[PDB]
A paper describes a structure:
NOD2, also known as NLRC2 or CARD15, belongs to the NLRC subfamily of NLRs. NOD2 possesses two tandem CARDs that function as an effector domain and is activated by muramyl dipeptide (MDP), a bacterial cell wall fragment. On activation by MDP, NOD2 is believed to undergo self-oligomerization via the central NOD domain, providing a scaffold for recruiting RIPK2 (receptor-interacting serine–threonine kinase 2) through CARD–CARD interactions. Here, we determined the crystal structure of the inactive ADP-bound form of NOD2, and revealed that ADP-bound NOD2 is maintained in an auto-inhibited/closed form through ADP-mediated and inner domain interactions of the NOD domain.
We also generated a construct in which we deleted the loop regions encoded in residues 245–251 and 626–635, in addition to the removal of the CARD (OcNOD2ΔCARDΔloop), because residues 245–251 are not conserved in zebrafish NOD2 and residues 626–635 are susceptible to proteolytic cleavage during purification. The OcNOD2Δloop construct exhibited activity comparable to the wild-type OcNOD2 in response to MDP, while the OcNOD2SER construct exhibited no activity in NF-κB reporter assays in HEK293T cells. We crystallized OcNOD2ΔCARDΔloop in two forms (form 1 and form 2) under different crystallization conditions and determined the crystal structures at 2.3 Å (form 1) and 3.3 Å (form 2) resolutions. The asymmetric unit of the form 1 and form 2 crystals contained one and two NOD2 molecules, respectively. The structures of the NOD2 molecules in these crystals were essentially the same, with root mean squared deviations (r.m.s.d.) between 0.4 and 1.1 Å. In the crystal structure, the electron density of the ADP molecule was observed clearly, even though it was not supplemented during purification and crystallization. ADP embedded at the centre of the NOD domain bridged the NBD and HD1, and bound to the WHD, allowing the subdomains to be closely packed.
Numbering used by the authors: 195 to 217, 225 to 241, 254 to 263, 270 to 505, 518 to 567, 577 to 612, 636 to 702, 714 to 1020
Write the structure that this text describes.
């Protein structure tokens, strides 16, 4: 026999493994890379733990894989594969913890609401209090807790009862189980500033990349050629491919592969289409819509009740109160004996369905979905804003023209649908004006855009944007995937004033670029830094850009561009006589790409800013750019920082400085120019009266280089600054430069 603490270790592993293995399909066979990103490269699950404080936060939209991530953390731990530093892992569902109001202690939490030790309960708990650094607790769906002012009081006792919310507050501070690791998953709304005081690391979960989707479908589909054919479908059906970047949609696609592969279209395009397809699928396991209508309305009523009550787990009494019989439950929407909706998005969908079709819903109540007496209305007002936003988009979608006929089957009279469509339409039409006139609110902007798209009425989008005066649209770090690109394009394409569209730090990808194209003609500037865009994406962007007279700036810092975009870049530079700014830093451009693209730059007259920071254009790259820029009349700023340029390239840039009369700022930090290259440059400055800033930091330059430059600075009175910070100068050489020309910056 073994002591009580080791027995519990083994019990807990056994239970956690058993609860995490499946979701028959094994989670091990199915789990696919879903990258974690941290705000300030991007990390796999394995590095989740690579004040103080002790809490790790995983944030992501609904359906992005947060639950499935935690369940894989559990399975990996319980079977020995990763996270072995923890002797105990305690998984909790926040929506379940919310359902207990009777107070309880840490011991009751761990033992009665997770895993009961067979023997020695008190010894086990003591062991835990004594080794908290070997414990992990996970809390899935933290946004589904209801916190108060009454739950904000200190509580350091592990044995004394209190509210679950007070326990959790104090766990997060380190007042209970100090040094135990915590992992919380949450939707982006309910991460407040009070919480971040106690977070060691905050991660964002965006969804599958384009290759993730492919791996996912290969794991789920082993029958020969089926996965290939689904990938072929996605690569021919862009909007559907874009939806699958969210893991929940990849799941639905996989689930409905038969129906999707039968037709050559019309495939689902919008979010609502996808939810109707999975509804169709479930119904087939039992016109067919009409036949199960009372069920669907009973399910929808419960869903709406749940949302209004912020209740996502229903007890058998709540279920017979809402009146959902066992045939209702068998349909597939309620699961997992207290039940919950298959996913929170199905709760939202079923409530939207109820709002569109139930005779108990007054027309006017729909105004509370869009922000603008009856029980329906009272429920909507108390609903979590992020569930209302989901519900509202589904409502808009169910009321589109595509679905007139489908819904008409369910009614004796269309009068009711007419009234709800008209109301929703009225709200949507004024929603962008309403948004801007109420003074970051841009997540909310995005949901309004989503609802407009779901409605699928071109004219409504046009009305919504009429009279706006958007110049700059900032949507950094906003969860912008491919499908949000489709929604943006649908609305923004009607703008009459060119917009600076800022989508830095999202997951646009190649599919998103494609989906964005229709509104490219409405952009004066497009910022797509840090968005996983490859050569395929930019080549398509550039082809469309050639026909967009207003587009003058493109920024693509930090993507996956290689030399294979160079020809498209050369066309962009040679053919767009309007183009002002191009940022291509932190890609994989080499000397070959730079020589190719440089031909375009030679035939360009208007470009002002060209950025290559972090590529590797090298000597031959620098050479070709320099010769192409020798006669160029507009370029004012060139950056070649960190490009592995040496003396041959410095000679070329120096020969270019002899001829060029417009470049004002030349950024050469972090290369290996050396004294010889700085001598060349210095010669050039003697025949240049236009350059103002030459940056040479971190270039292996010696005092000899500084002397060559100082000599040139004696006969050049146009240059303002020459950066030499971090070069190998002795302290004595540093002292000696300080008395000489002050335009040297050290
Ligand atoms: N990493 C993943 N690998 C495979 N399937 C996943 C992954 N993440 C999510 N899924 C699938 O998508 C569904 C929705 O994801 P879920 O984790 O419930 O999202 P969230 O918890 O963020 O709302 C899951 O039930 C599962 O079918």
């Amino acid at each position: 026999e073994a002591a009580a603490c080791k027995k519990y270790m083994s019990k807990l592993r056994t239970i956690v493994a058993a609860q995490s293995r499946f979701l028959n399909l094994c989670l091990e066979d199915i789990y696919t890379e879903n990258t974690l990103e941290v705000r300030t490269a991007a990390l796999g699950l394995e590095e989740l733990f690579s004040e103080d404080a002790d809490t790790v936060l995983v944030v992501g939209e609904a359906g992005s894989g947060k639950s499935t991530l935690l369940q894989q953390v559990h399975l990996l731990w319980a079977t020995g594969q990763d996270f072995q530093e923890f002797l105990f892992v305690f998984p909790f569902s926040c929506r379940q913890l919310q359902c207990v109001a009777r107070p309880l202690s840490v011991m009751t939490l761990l033992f009665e609401h997770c895993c009961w030790p067979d023997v020695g309960q008190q010894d086990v708990f003591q062991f835990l209090l004594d080794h908290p650094d070997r414990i992990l607790l996970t809390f899935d769906g933290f946004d589904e807790f209801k916190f108060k002012f009454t739950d904000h009081e200190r509580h350091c006792s592990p044995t004394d009862p209190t509210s679950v919310q007070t326990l959790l507050f104090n766990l997060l501070q380190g007042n209970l189980l100090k040094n135990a690791r915590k992992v919380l998953t949450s939707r982006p709304d309910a991460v407040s500033a009070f919480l971040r005081k106690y977070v060691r690391t905050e991660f964002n979960l965006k969804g599958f990349s384009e290759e993730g989707i492919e791996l996912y479908l290969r794991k789920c589909h082993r029958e020969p050629g089926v996965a290939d054919r689904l990938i072929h479908l996605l690569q021919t059906t862009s909007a559907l491919h874009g939806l699958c970047h969210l893991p929940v949609f990849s799941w639905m696609v996989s689930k409905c592969h038969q129906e999707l592969l039968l037709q050559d279209g019309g495939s689902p395009k919008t979010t609502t289409d996808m939810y109707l397809l999975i509804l169709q699928h479930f119904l087939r396991h039992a016109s067919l819509l009409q036949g199960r209508l009372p069920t669907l309305l009973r399910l929808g009523q419960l869903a709406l009740w749940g949302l209004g009550m912020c209740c996502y787990v229903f007890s058998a009494q709540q279920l017979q109160a809402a009146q959902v019989d066992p045939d209702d439950i068998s349909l597939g929407f309620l699961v997992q004996a207290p039940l919950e909706f298959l996913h929170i998005t199905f709760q939202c969908f079923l409530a939207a369905f109820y709002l569109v079709l139930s005779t108990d819903v007054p027309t006017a109540s729909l105004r509370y979905l869009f922000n603008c007496e009856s029980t329906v209305a009272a429920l909507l007002q108390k609903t979590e804003p992020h569930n209302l936003q989901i519900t509202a988009a589904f409502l808009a979608g169910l009321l589109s023209r595509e679905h007139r006929d489908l819904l008409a089957a369910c009614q004796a009279s269309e009068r009711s649908l007419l009234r709800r469509r008209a109301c929703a339409r009225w709200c949507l039409a004024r929603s962008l004006h309403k948004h801007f006139r109420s003074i970051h609110a841009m997540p909310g902007f995005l949901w309004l855009i989503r609802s407009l798209y779901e409605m699928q009425e071109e004219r409504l989008a046009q009305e919504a944007v009429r009279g706006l005066n958007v110049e700059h649209l900032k949507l950094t770090f906003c969860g912008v995937g491919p499908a949000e690109c489709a929604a943006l394009a649908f609305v923004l394409r009607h703008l009459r004033r060119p917009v600076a569209l800022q989508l830095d730090h999202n997951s646009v990808g190649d599919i998103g670029v494609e989906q964005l194209l229709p509104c490219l003609g409405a952009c004066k500037a497009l910022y797509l830094r840090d968005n996983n865009i490859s050569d395929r994406g930019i080549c398509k962007l550039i082809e469309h850009a050639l026909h967009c007279e207003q587009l003058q700036k493109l920024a693509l810092f930090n993507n996956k561009l290689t030399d294979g975009c160079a020809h498209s870049v050369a066309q962009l530079l040679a053919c767009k006589q309007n183009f002002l700014a191009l940022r291509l830093g932190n890609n994989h451009i080499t000397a070959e790409g730079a020589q190719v693209l440089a031909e375009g730059l030679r035939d360009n007259s208007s470009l002002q800013f060209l950025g290559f920071w972090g590529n590797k254009v090298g000597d031959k790259g620098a050479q070709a750019l320099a010769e192409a820029l020798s006669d160029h009349q507009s370029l004012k700023w060139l950056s070649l920082v960190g490009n592995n340029i040496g003396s041959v390239g410095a000679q070329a840039l120096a020969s270019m400085l002899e001829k060029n009369v417009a470049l004002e700022e030349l950024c050469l930090e972090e290369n290996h120019l050396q004294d010889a290259g700085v001598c060349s440059l210095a010669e050039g400055l003697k025949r240049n009266s236009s350059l103002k800033v030459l940056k040479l930091s971190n270039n292996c330059i010696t005092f000899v280089g500084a002397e060559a430059l100082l000599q040139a600075l004696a006969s050049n009175d146009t240059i303002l600054e020459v950066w030499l910070r971090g070069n190998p100068f002795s302290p004595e050489e540093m002292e000696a430069l300080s008395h000489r020309d002050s335009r040297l910056l050290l």
